[PDB]
Amino acid sequence: STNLVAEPFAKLEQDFGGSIGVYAMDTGSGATVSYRAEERFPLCSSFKGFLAAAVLARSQQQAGLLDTPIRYGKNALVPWSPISEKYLTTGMTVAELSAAAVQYSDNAAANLLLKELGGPAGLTAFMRSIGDTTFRLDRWELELNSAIPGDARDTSSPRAVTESLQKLTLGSALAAPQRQQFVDWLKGNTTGNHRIRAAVPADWAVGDKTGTCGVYGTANDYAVVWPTGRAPIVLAVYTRAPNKDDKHSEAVIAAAARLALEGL
Ligand SMILES: C[C@H](CS)C(=O)NCB(O)O
Numbered sequence: 001s002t003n004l005v006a007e008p009f010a011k012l013e014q015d016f017g018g019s020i021g022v023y024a025m026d027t028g029s030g031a032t033v034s035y036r037a038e039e040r041f042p043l044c045s046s047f048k049g050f051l052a053a054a055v056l057a058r059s060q061q062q063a064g065l066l067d068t069p070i071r072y073g074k075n076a077l078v079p080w081s082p083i084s085e086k087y088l089t090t091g092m093t094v095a096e097l098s099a100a101a102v103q104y105s106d107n108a109a110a111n112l113l114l115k116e117l118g119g120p121a122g123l124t125a126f127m128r129s130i131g132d133t134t135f136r137l138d139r140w141e142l143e144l145n146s147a148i149p150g151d152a153r154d155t156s157s158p159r160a161v162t163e164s165l166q167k168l169t170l171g172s173a174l175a176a177p178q179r180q181q182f183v184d185w186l187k188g189n190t191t192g193n194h195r196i197r198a199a200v201p202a203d204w205a206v207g208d209k210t211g212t213c214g215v216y217g218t219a220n221d222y223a224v225v226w227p228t229g230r231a232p233i234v235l236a237v238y239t240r241a242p243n244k245d246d247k248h249s250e251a252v253i254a255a256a257a258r259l260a261l262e263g264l
Helices: 007-016 044-059 082-086 094-104 107-116 119-129 158-169 176-187 250-263
Strands: 019-026 032-035 205-212 219-226 233-240
Touching: 007 019, 007 032, 007 250, 019 158, 019 250, 032 250, 044 094, 044 107, 044 119, 044 158, 044 176, 044 205, 044 219, 082 094, 082 107, 094 107, 094 176, 107 119, 158 176, 158 219, 158 233, 176 205, 176 219, 219 250, 233 250
Parallel strands: none
Antiparallel strands: 019 032, 019 233, 205 219, 219 233
16 A cells, blocks of 8 residues: 555644554545555454454354343443443343444443454454454453554554455445445444544445544544445544553544545
């Protein structure tokens, strides 16, 4: 990946104080926009999108998986598990857990689904199975948010995120019903209104999955975007910063997303 008009990104990055990672593709034209697209960034909660897709893939082999109820315990409830906490007394189905992980970044739901898939190694294996050799999940919630500079655990690249997202939402990695369900969950996300969505024209449909580590200025968003009458755009925007106390910036994510969309 290159970019011969990178200076707007470089200037945004300098103003941010950290590192910005962008990859965007117009699936109609094959045009792309790149900045640190090959460099590793922490996934934070953005892994939860791929987790839901992995669950949907498994559902293609196990009938009834999505409808299976899980009666989880109180000590499954790690901080920021708003749906799992609300539904603790009833339990939740696998489908509901997937929707909560995607649309609310629900931490307990993600861990419960990781367990059904064989842990971080199992999700990493799923990603390897669709041709993604960059993605690695190593730890569970909340430990995977440590976001330590240079630590390759729980990281991917903006390009590999975008490519895998395209395969699962638009390609043939998932069967058609599973694929539509994944897209529908992403379109229903509630956590992303100040990130990529804030850069997309009001009349374009969007689904997205955010991540926020809470340390080292580290936060992100990826999305499928449907321009009027066109094939969709798929993009990923990731950030990090060198100091543990550096604040993440949603505005920086939105601005980088806008630069990518304008570049296309
Ligand atoms: C620790 C942090 C507080 S916002 C969190 O729960 N992130 C979920 B994710 O992995 O982004």
